[PDB]
Amino acid sequence: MQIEVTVRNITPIFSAAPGSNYITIDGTINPPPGVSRFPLVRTRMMYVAADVGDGVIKSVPLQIVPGNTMRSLLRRTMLKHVIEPALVEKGNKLSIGAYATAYSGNATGNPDGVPSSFDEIATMRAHPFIGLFGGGPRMLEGRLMVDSLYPIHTNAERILGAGYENEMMSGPITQVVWAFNAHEVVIPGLKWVWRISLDRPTDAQVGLVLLALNKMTNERIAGGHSKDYGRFVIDGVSLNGEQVWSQSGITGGEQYFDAVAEAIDGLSSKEFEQFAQSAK
Amino acid sequence: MQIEVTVRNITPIFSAAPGSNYITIDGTINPPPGVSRFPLVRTRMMYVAADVGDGVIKSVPLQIVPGNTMRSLLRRTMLKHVIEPALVEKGNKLSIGAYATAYSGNATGNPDGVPSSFDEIATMRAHPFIGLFGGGPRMLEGRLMVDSLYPIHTNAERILGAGYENEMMSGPITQVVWARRMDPILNLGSSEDVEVINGGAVAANGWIQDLLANSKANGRGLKAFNAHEVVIPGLKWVWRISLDRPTDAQVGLVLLALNKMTNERIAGGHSKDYGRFVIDGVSLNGEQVWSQSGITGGEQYFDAVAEAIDGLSSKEFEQFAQSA
Amino acid sequence: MFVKQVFFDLGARIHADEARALVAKLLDDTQPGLVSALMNYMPASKTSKTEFPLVQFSNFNQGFALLGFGEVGAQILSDATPIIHDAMAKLFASRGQGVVVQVSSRDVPLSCEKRPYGLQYTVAKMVVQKKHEHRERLANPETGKVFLEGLFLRSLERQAAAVGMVLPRDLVVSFKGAERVSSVKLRPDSTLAHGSLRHAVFEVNARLGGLWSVGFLLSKGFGHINTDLQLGQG
């Protein structure tokens, strides 16, 4: 529900881009001829309309972390940090296909084109995780809408023009790190905006997203696990635009946290098996 | 009555064009076969005669959100934030036919052959919702005509004859954005994560053996890799919502939808946040009425629609949807 | 043509020859035809074939891996994978808490093109001596050099002939040096050992575009490396 966090990276970010790219040296990034080819895995590309040239609007490059990856990040943080640890007691162990439908979108391929009856979608979009992350056999839409990670940049000004007059990154953002094959990463210390959106959500769903954002620092995204890429820290979480973050955590809007705590206290596996069972 | 809604998208716009398109690793949309083509669902495209060079007009591409899509979007935001709160505050109860005819123009797929009597036409066209969006079994014509969503680009230069001669974008506005699936049971690793799965690690290993048996060998497993072409974010579009002899209540309902358009999404791709936008301006027969706090102006239309929410019953929807 | 590479993850590293011995022991009781094809045995008895090994083990950081050269080896690998994976699943679930066995696959194509400039390739764990005459050749560098050149060229030629693709016969090779000299053992606690080179560097004018195996003891995971990694690796 218009949840917008800002994060700071400390290590490089490597959200690799699909491309057959190659470099010779830092003077030219993609050479025309094939002398001294050294292959490149680019970071993720986002051409964007921006005010470059003092008045005109042009497509310019800018490097992001995609919202599909952070949607999977928010998903795995909640599933592996409260949903599995508050599911590990009192029985109710997940099915294997239920675990696939919780971690991925579906249990398997070929989702059945038979739709589900409404008493399902009424029960599932009210439950904290399933209505947050829809899909499965019926490809349920869900409520939670995950934006891609936008660096607070001069190319990113028209998207982020309202709340940020200052703290505005300019010039180069990215650099090449070799190890003879080259890799392209985002320089650390950049401030990013990650936007989380939900339509008409229940108290437990926004509490779950909020609880996950209390603890988002631990899991590393968009880089090599061996290469130490992915560390980030969060300052400035906004909840309908009002600042709800400190060093110790959220400390604000406690009705959301009470609601989701009562929800995972009442969490059961039956809704997850009613998700993942492909009614073909 | 002409309304020109000039908007700026916040997120990328993805309104999927039908058509099984294909994409290589680097560019080359729809390659010759055998270069390992990946599936590609492009954004909705519109060919436009445009001034390419001096004296030549060619059918160039320019990719849009369809006018059917935003006609249903304006209709859906009208129903979700004006008509349904009114009908639940007064307790007026729709039928399944009235509900389906309100959101989809018809109740069933078979329209009635007979035409509606003229008193019924006058009542449902003086209705501030049904007059905007007609349909029904007797196939009513709505007063509202919704154009498709044109970006302010050189390609739409012949389209934007009046206004928008500035803010004139030259280069390309689309992007191939890649999204993949994994099988996360192919990413388990530790059996302490598998102790949540009932039956132990043997069932997870059976799913490993299932996907390797699929890999040597048409039941699809998981772990896809797909691309979709989206519009870039941050570019400014124009929308045209015109009206055919409107009552002031119908215009007030359109402006009530335009006040809180920004909650809804002008795209598909719901989970990827695609479709977030902010309205830069709203032109009411050329005059600008848009502010940061909704619409500043058009007070007679709003007053007319405030008198139209009062006196609004479900009965008009019911004999609009009732088939002879 | 193409060679298929199957990676098996158990959470701990086991050596390729030790994995070969371990794989034979678990399946010795049941399904002997699958074991015969995997180890390249003669269809009648236990003795392995004299020809080029289509199926060979290799190295994997968290376990071991299988290489199947050509369509026949790929099919043998394709039908072998579920039974072997279930065998490790039962073996590692019999003792301890249990570990998830994780698989991976690649279908690396093979190619070769002749270029008029020398190209460098390094091979690790290279067994070169198997009779006394090769030990006599290795004493003098001049008469051991041409032996190593002929061994490398005949290895490339027999792998091209076994995979079913044509190799140009105007290739020239050159050997620069090897970092270390070490022995290998056929079986543990055996007095017999075979001499071997470690981190040997070779220079071929032509280029290679896939997994290439050279020399002796190919089925033990000895002396093959991915050339496709080594183009511009540095």
Short mmCIF file of N, CA, C and O in Angstrom, two decimals, chain B residues 101-202:
data_model
loop_
_atom_site.label_atom_id
_atom_site.label_comp_id
_atom_site.label_asym_id
_atom_site.label_seq_id
_atom_site.Cartn_x
_atom_site.Cartn_y
_atom_site.Cartn_z
N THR B 101 -23.06 -6.55 -16.46
CA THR B 101 -23.33 -5.55 -17.49
C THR B 101 -22.69 -4.22 -17.12
O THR B 101 -22.35 -3.42 -18.01
N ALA B 102 -22.50 -3.96 -15.83
CA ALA B 102 -21.82 -2.75 -15.41
C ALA B 102 -20.33 -2.81 -15.71
O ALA B 102 -19.75 -1.84 -16.20
N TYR B 103 -19.69 -3.95 -15.44
CA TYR B 103 -18.26 -4.06 -15.76
C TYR B 103 -17.92 -4.53 -17.17
O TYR B 103 -16.78 -4.34 -17.61
N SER B 104 -18.85 -5.14 -17.91
CA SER B 104 -18.48 -5.69 -19.20
C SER B 104 -19.43 -5.33 -20.33
O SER B 104 -19.32 -5.92 -21.41
N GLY B 105 -20.37 -4.42 -20.11
CA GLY B 105 -21.29 -4.00 -21.14
C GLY B 105 -22.44 -4.95 -21.41
O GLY B 105 -23.50 -4.50 -21.85
N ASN B 106 -22.26 -6.25 -21.17
CA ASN B 106 -23.28 -7.26 -21.42
C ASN B 106 -23.36 -8.18 -20.21
O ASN B 106 -22.43 -8.26 -19.40
N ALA B 107 -24.49 -8.87 -20.08
CA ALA B 107 -24.63 -9.90 -19.06
C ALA B 107 -24.23 -11.27 -19.58
O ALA B 107 -23.52 -12.01 -18.89
N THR B 108 -24.68 -11.62 -20.78
CA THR B 108 -24.31 -12.85 -21.46
C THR B 108 -23.61 -12.52 -22.76
O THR B 108 -23.45 -11.35 -23.13
N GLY B 109 -23.17 -13.55 -23.47
CA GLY B 109 -22.57 -13.37 -24.77
C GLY B 109 -23.54 -13.25 -25.92
O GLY B 109 -23.11 -13.01 -27.06
N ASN B 110 -24.83 -13.42 -25.66
CA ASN B 110 -25.84 -13.30 -26.70
C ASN B 110 -26.60 -11.99 -26.51
O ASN B 110 -27.41 -11.89 -25.57
N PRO B 111 -26.38 -10.98 -27.35
CA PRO B 111 -27.22 -9.79 -27.30
C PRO B 111 -28.63 -10.09 -27.80
O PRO B 111 -28.85 -11.00 -28.59
N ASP B 112 -29.59 -9.31 -27.31
CA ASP B 112 -30.96 -9.46 -27.75
C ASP B 112 -31.14 -8.86 -29.13
O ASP B 112 -30.49 -7.88 -29.50
N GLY B 113 -32.03 -9.47 -29.92
CA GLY B 113 -32.27 -8.98 -31.26
C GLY B 113 -33.13 -7.73 -31.29
O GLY B 113 -33.02 -6.91 -32.21
N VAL B 114 -33.99 -7.57 -30.30
CA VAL B 114 -34.93 -6.44 -30.30
C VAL B 114 -34.20 -5.17 -29.87
O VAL B 114 -33.18 -5.26 -29.16
N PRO B 115 -34.63 -3.99 -30.30
CA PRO B 115 -34.09 -2.76 -29.74
C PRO B 115 -34.89 -2.30 -28.53
O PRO B 115 -36.07 -2.61 -28.38
N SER B 116 -34.21 -1.56 -27.66
CA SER B 116 -34.86 -1.02 -26.47
C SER B 116 -35.78 0.14 -26.83
O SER B 116 -35.53 0.89 -27.77
N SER B 117 -36.87 0.26 -26.06
CA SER B 117 -37.82 1.35 -26.25
C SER B 117 -37.17 2.68 -25.87
O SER B 117 -36.26 2.73 -25.05
N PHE B 118 -37.68 3.76 -26.48
CA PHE B 118 -36.96 5.03 -26.46
C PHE B 118 -36.94 5.65 -25.06
O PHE B 118 -36.00 6.37 -24.71
N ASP B 119 -37.97 5.38 -24.25
CA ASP B 119 -37.94 5.82 -22.86
C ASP B 119 -36.82 5.15 -22.09
O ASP B 119 -36.13 5.79 -21.28
N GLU B 120 -36.58 3.86 -22.36
CA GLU B 120 -35.46 3.15 -21.76
C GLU B 120 -34.12 3.72 -22.24
O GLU B 120 -33.20 3.87 -21.43
N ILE B 121 -34.02 4.06 -23.53
CA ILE B 121 -32.79 4.66 -24.06
C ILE B 121 -32.52 6.01 -23.41
O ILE B 121 -31.39 6.31 -23.02
N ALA B 122 -33.57 6.82 -23.25
CA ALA B 122 -33.42 8.14 -22.65
C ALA B 122 -33.04 8.05 -21.18
O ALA B 122 -32.22 8.84 -20.69
N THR B 123 -33.62 7.08 -20.45
CA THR B 123 -33.29 6.94 -19.04
C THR B 123 -31.87 6.41 -18.84
O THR B 123 -31.15 6.86 -17.95
N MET B 124 -31.44 5.45 -19.67
CA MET B 124 -30.11 4.88 -19.46
C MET B 124 -29.02 5.74 -20.09
O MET B 124 -27.84 5.56 -19.77
N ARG B 125 -29.38 6.67 -20.97
CA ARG B 125 -28.38 7.61 -21.48
C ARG B 125 -28.35 8.88 -20.64
O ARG B 125 -27.34 9.60 -20.65
N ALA B 126 -29.43 9.19 -19.92
CA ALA B 126 -29.38 10.23 -18.90
C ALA B 126 -28.82 9.71 -17.59
O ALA B 126 -28.52 10.52 -16.69
N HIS B 127 -28.67 8.40 -17.46
CA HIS B 127 -27.97 7.80 -16.34
C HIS B 127 -26.50 8.22 -16.38
O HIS B 127 -25.87 8.15 -17.44
N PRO B 128 -25.92 8.67 -15.26
CA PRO B 128 -24.52 9.09 -15.32
C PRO B 128 -23.47 7.99 -15.44
O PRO B 128 -22.31 8.32 -15.73
N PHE B 129 -23.81 6.71 -15.28
CA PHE B 129 -22.87 5.64 -15.58
C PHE B 129 -23.21 4.92 -16.87
O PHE B 129 -22.34 4.72 -17.72
N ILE B 130 -24.47 4.50 -17.03
CA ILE B 130 -24.89 3.72 -18.19
C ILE B 130 -24.83 4.56 -19.47
O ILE B 130 -24.59 4.03 -20.56
N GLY B 131 -25.02 5.87 -19.35
CA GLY B 131 -24.84 6.76 -20.48
C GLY B 131 -23.41 6.81 -20.97
O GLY B 131 -23.17 6.94 -22.17
N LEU B 132 -22.45 6.71 -20.05
CA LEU B 132 -21.05 6.66 -20.44
C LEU B 132 -20.72 5.35 -21.14
O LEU B 132 -20.13 5.35 -22.23
N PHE B 133 -21.11 4.23 -20.55
CA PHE B 133 -20.81 2.91 -21.07
C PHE B 133 -22.11 2.17 -21.34
O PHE B 133 -22.79 1.75 -20.40
N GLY B 134 -22.45 2.00 -22.61
CA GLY B 134 -23.73 1.44 -22.96
C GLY B 134 -23.72 -0.08 -22.96
O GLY B 134 -23.42 -0.70 -21.94
N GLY B 135 -24.06 -0.68 -24.09
CA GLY B 135 -24.12 -2.13 -24.15
C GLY B 135 -25.47 -2.65 -23.72
O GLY B 135 -26.51 -2.13 -24.15
N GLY B 136 -25.48 -3.67 -22.88
CA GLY B 136 -26.71 -4.31 -22.49
C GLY B 136 -27.14 -5.34 -23.51
O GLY B 136 -26.50 -5.50 -24.56
N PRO B 137 -28.21 -6.08 -23.22
CA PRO B 137 -28.74 -7.03 -24.21
C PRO B 137 -29.28 -6.36 -25.46
O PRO B 137 -29.16 -6.93 -26.54
N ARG B 138 -29.85 -5.17 -25.34
CA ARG B 138 -30.39 -4.45 -26.48
C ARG B 138 -29.38 -3.48 -27.07
O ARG B 138 -29.76 -2.63 -27.90
N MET B 139 -28.11 -3.58 -26.65
CA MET B 139 -26.95 -2.98 -27.32
C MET B 139 -27.04 -1.45 -27.36
O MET B 139 -27.24 -0.83 -28.41
N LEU B 140 -26.95 -0.85 -26.18
CA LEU B 140 -27.00 0.61 -26.07
C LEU B 140 -25.66 1.23 -26.45
O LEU B 140 -24.60 0.72 -26.10
N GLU B 141 -25.73 2.35 -27.17
CA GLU B 141 -24.55 3.14 -27.46
C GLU B 141 -24.25 4.09 -26.31
O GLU B 141 -25.11 4.85 -25.87
N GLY B 142 -23.02 4.03 -25.80
CA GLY B 142 -22.58 4.91 -24.74
C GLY B 142 -22.19 6.27 -25.28
O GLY B 142 -21.80 6.42 -26.43
N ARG B 143 -22.30 7.29 -24.42
CA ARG B 143 -21.91 8.64 -24.81
C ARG B 143 -20.41 8.86 -24.76
O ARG B 143 -19.93 9.86 -25.30
N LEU B 144 -19.66 7.96 -24.13
CA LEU B 144 -18.24 8.15 -23.91
C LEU B 144 -17.45 7.43 -24.99
O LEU B 144 -17.71 6.27 -25.30
N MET B 145 -16.48 8.14 -25.57
CA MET B 145 -15.57 7.56 -26.55
C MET B 145 -14.14 7.67 -26.03
O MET B 145 -13.62 8.78 -25.85
N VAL B 146 -13.50 6.53 -25.78
CA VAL B 146 -12.20 6.47 -25.13
C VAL B 146 -11.13 6.14 -26.16
O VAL B 146 -11.15 5.06 -26.77
N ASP B 147 -10.17 7.05 -26.35
CA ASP B 147 -9.06 6.84 -27.25
C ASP B 147 -7.97 6.02 -26.56
O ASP B 147 -7.95 5.86 -25.34
N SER B 148 -7.04 5.48 -27.35
CA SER B 148 -5.92 4.74 -26.82
C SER B 148 -4.79 5.68 -26.41
O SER B 148 -4.77 6.86 -26.75
N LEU B 149 -3.83 5.13 -25.67
CA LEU B 149 -2.85 5.94 -24.94
C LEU B 149 -1.59 6.12 -25.78
O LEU B 149 -0.71 5.25 -25.79
N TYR B 150 -1.47 7.25 -26.44
CA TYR B 150 -0.39 7.80 -27.27
C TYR B 150 0.68 8.46 -26.42
O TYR B 150 0.37 9.36 -25.63
N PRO B 151 1.94 8.07 -26.57
CA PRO B 151 3.03 8.84 -25.96
C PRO B 151 3.34 10.06 -26.81
O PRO B 151 3.08 10.10 -28.01
N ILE B 152 3.91 11.08 -26.17
CA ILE B 152 4.29 12.27 -26.92
C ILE B 152 5.61 11.97 -27.62
O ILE B 152 6.69 12.19 -27.07
N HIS B 153 5.51 11.45 -28.84
CA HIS B 153 6.64 11.03 -29.64
C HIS B 153 6.51 11.61 -31.03
O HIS B 153 5.44 12.07 -31.42
N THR B 154 7.63 11.59 -31.78
CA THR B 154 7.63 12.05 -33.16
C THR B 154 6.70 11.23 -34.04
O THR B 154 6.08 11.77 -34.97
N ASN B 155 6.56 9.94 -33.73
CA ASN B 155 5.66 9.06 -34.46
C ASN B 155 4.22 9.52 -34.37
O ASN B 155 3.50 9.49 -35.37
N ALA B 156 3.79 10.00 -33.21
CA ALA B 156 2.45 10.56 -33.07
C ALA B 156 2.38 12.04 -33.42
O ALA B 156 1.46 12.72 -32.97
N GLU B 157 3.34 12.56 -34.21
CA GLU B 157 3.32 13.98 -34.58
C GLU B 157 2.12 14.34 -35.44
O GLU B 157 1.51 15.40 -35.25
N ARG B 158 1.75 13.47 -36.39
CA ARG B 158 0.57 13.71 -37.20
C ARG B 158 -0.71 13.60 -36.38
O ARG B 158 -1.73 14.21 -36.73
N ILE B 159 -0.68 12.81 -35.31
CA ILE B 159 -1.84 12.67 -34.44
C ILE B 159 -2.03 13.92 -33.59
O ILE B 159 -3.15 14.44 -33.48
N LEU B 160 -0.96 14.44 -33.00
CA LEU B 160 -1.05 15.60 -32.11
C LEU B 160 -0.95 16.90 -32.91
O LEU B 160 0.05 17.62 -32.87
N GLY B 161 -2.02 17.18 -33.66
CA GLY B 161 -2.07 18.40 -34.45
C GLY B 161 -2.18 19.65 -33.58
O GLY B 161 -1.55 20.67 -33.88
N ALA B 162 -2.96 19.58 -32.52
CA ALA B 162 -3.17 20.70 -31.61
C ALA B 162 -2.49 20.40 -30.28
O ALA B 162 -2.82 19.41 -29.62
N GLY B 163 -1.55 21.25 -29.89
CA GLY B 163 -0.82 21.07 -28.65
C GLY B 163 0.28 20.04 -28.75
O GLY B 163 0.44 19.39 -29.79
N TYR B 164 1.05 19.90 -27.67
CA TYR B 164 2.13 18.91 -27.51
C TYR B 164 3.21 19.02 -28.58
O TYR B 164 3.84 18.02 -28.93
N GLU B 165 3.44 20.22 -29.12
CA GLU B 165 4.49 20.39 -30.12
C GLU B 165 5.86 20.44 -29.46
O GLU B 165 6.88 20.21 -30.13
N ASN B 166 5.91 20.73 -28.17
CA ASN B 166 7.12 20.55 -27.37
C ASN B 166 7.11 19.12 -26.83
O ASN B 166 6.36 18.28 -27.33
N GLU B 167 7.96 18.86 -25.82
CA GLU B 167 8.13 17.57 -25.11
C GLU B 167 8.23 16.38 -26.07
O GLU B 167 7.63 15.32 -25.89
N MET B 168 9.05 16.58 -27.10
CA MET B 168 8.98 15.84 -28.35
C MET B 168 10.11 14.82 -28.33
O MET B 168 11.28 15.20 -28.47
N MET B 169 9.78 13.55 -28.16
CA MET B 169 10.80 12.51 -28.01
C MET B 169 11.14 11.88 -29.35
O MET B 169 10.25 11.57 -30.15
N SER B 170 12.43 11.64 -29.57
CA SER B 170 12.95 11.17 -30.85
C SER B 170 13.27 9.68 -30.84
O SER B 170 12.84 8.95 -31.73
N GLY B 171 14.02 9.22 -29.84
CA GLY B 171 14.58 7.89 -29.86
C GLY B 171 13.60 6.79 -29.50
O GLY B 171 12.39 6.99 -29.47
N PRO B 172 14.12 5.60 -29.23
CA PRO B 172 13.26 4.45 -28.93
C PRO B 172 12.78 4.45 -27.48
O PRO B 172 13.47 4.86 -26.55
N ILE B 173 11.55 3.97 -27.32
CA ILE B 173 10.84 3.98 -26.04
C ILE B 173 10.51 2.59 -25.51
O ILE B 173 9.86 2.48 -24.47
N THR B 174 11.00 1.53 -26.15
CA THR B 174 10.76 0.17 -25.67
C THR B 174 12.03 -0.49 -25.16
O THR B 174 13.15 -0.07 -25.50
N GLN B 175 11.84 -1.52 -24.34
CA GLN B 175 12.92 -2.27 -23.72
C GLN B 175 12.54 -3.74 -23.59
O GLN B 175 11.42 -4.06 -23.19
N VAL B 176 13.50 -4.61 -23.89
CA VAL B 176 13.31 -6.04 -23.65
C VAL B 176 13.75 -6.36 -22.23
O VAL B 176 14.94 -6.36 -21.92
N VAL B 177 12.78 -6.63 -21.35
CA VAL B 177 13.05 -6.89 -19.94
C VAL B 177 12.87 -8.39 -19.72
O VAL B 177 11.86 -8.97 -20.14
N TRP B 178 13.86 -9.01 -19.09
CA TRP B 178 13.96 -10.46 -18.98
C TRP B 178 13.58 -10.89 -17.57
O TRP B 178 14.11 -10.36 -16.59
N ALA B 179 12.66 -11.85 -17.49
CA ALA B 179 12.23 -12.44 -16.22
C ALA B 179 12.31 -13.95 -16.35
O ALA B 179 11.90 -14.52 -17.36
N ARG B 180 12.86 -14.60 -15.33
CA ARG B 180 13.02 -16.05 -15.37
C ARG B 180 12.38 -16.66 -14.13
O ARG B 180 12.15 -15.96 -13.14
N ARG B 181 12.09 -17.94 -14.22
CA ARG B 181 11.74 -18.73 -13.06
C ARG B 181 12.90 -19.66 -12.70
O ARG B 181 13.76 -19.96 -13.54
N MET B 182 12.95 -20.07 -11.44
CA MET B 182 13.73 -21.24 -11.05
C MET B 182 12.75 -22.32 -10.62
O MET B 182 11.57 -22.05 -10.41
N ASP B 183 13.27 -23.53 -10.46
CA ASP B 183 12.67 -24.44 -9.51
C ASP B 183 13.41 -24.27 -8.20
O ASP B 183 14.62 -24.51 -8.14
N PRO B 184 12.75 -23.79 -7.14
CA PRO B 184 13.48 -23.54 -5.89
C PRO B 184 13.85 -24.81 -5.15
O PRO B 184 14.68 -24.77 -4.23
N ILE B 185 13.25 -25.94 -5.51
CA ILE B 185 13.70 -27.22 -4.97
C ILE B 185 14.97 -27.66 -5.68
O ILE B 185 15.69 -28.55 -5.21
N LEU B 186 15.28 -27.04 -6.83
CA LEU B 186 16.61 -27.18 -7.41
C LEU B 186 17.59 -26.20 -6.77
O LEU B 186 18.78 -26.19 -7.10
N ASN B 187 17.10 -25.34 -5.87
CA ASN B 187 17.95 -24.42 -5.12
C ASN B 187 17.87 -24.65 -3.61
O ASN B 187 18.06 -23.70 -2.85
N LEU B 188 17.58 -25.88 -3.17
CA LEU B 188 17.43 -26.13 -1.74
C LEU B 188 18.78 -26.16 -1.03
O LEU B 188 19.07 -25.30 -0.19
N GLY B 189 19.62 -27.14 -1.36
CA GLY B 189 20.92 -27.25 -0.75
C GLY B 189 20.93 -27.95 0.60
O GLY B 189 21.48 -29.05 0.73
N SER B 190 20.33 -27.33 1.61
CA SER B 190 20.42 -27.79 2.99
C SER B 190 19.14 -28.50 3.40
O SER B 190 18.04 -28.01 3.13
N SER B 191 19.29 -29.65 4.06
CA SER B 191 18.13 -30.47 4.43
C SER B 191 17.36 -29.87 5.60
O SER B 191 16.20 -30.24 5.84
N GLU B 192 17.99 -28.95 6.34
CA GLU B 192 17.28 -28.25 7.40
C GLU B 192 16.21 -27.32 6.83
O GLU B 192 15.21 -27.03 7.50
N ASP B 193 16.40 -26.85 5.60
CA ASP B 193 15.33 -26.15 4.90
C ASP B 193 14.29 -27.14 4.39
O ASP B 193 13.12 -26.77 4.17
N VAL B 194 14.68 -28.40 4.18
CA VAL B 194 13.78 -29.41 3.65
C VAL B 194 12.93 -30.05 4.74
O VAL B 194 11.88 -30.65 4.44
N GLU B 195 13.30 -29.86 6.01
CA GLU B 195 12.53 -30.42 7.12
C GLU B 195 11.15 -29.76 7.25
O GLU B 195 10.26 -30.30 7.91
N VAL B 196 10.97 -28.59 6.63
CA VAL B 196 9.65 -27.98 6.54
C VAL B 196 8.76 -28.77 5.59
O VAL B 196 7.56 -28.96 5.84
N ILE B 197 9.34 -29.27 4.49
CA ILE B 197 8.60 -30.13 3.57
C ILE B 197 8.32 -31.46 4.25
O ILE B 197 9.23 -32.11 4.78
N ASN B 198 7.05 -31.87 4.24
CA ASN B 198 6.67 -33.15 4.81
C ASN B 198 7.20 -34.30 3.96
O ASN B 198 7.42 -34.17 2.75
N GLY B 199 7.43 -35.44 4.61
CA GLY B 199 7.96 -36.60 3.94
C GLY B 199 9.47 -36.68 3.88
O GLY B 199 10.00 -37.70 3.42
N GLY B 200 10.18 -35.66 4.34
CA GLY B 200 11.63 -35.70 4.37
C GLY B 200 12.27 -35.24 3.08
O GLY B 200 11.65 -34.63 2.20
N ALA B 201 13.57 -35.55 2.96
CA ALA B 201 14.33 -35.10 1.81
C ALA B 201 14.16 -36.03 0.62
O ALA B 201 14.56 -35.70 -0.50
N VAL B 202 13.57 -37.21 0.84
CA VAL B 202 13.42 -38.23 -0.20
C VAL B 202 12.41 -37.76 -1.25
O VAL B 202 12.60 -38.01 -2.45
#
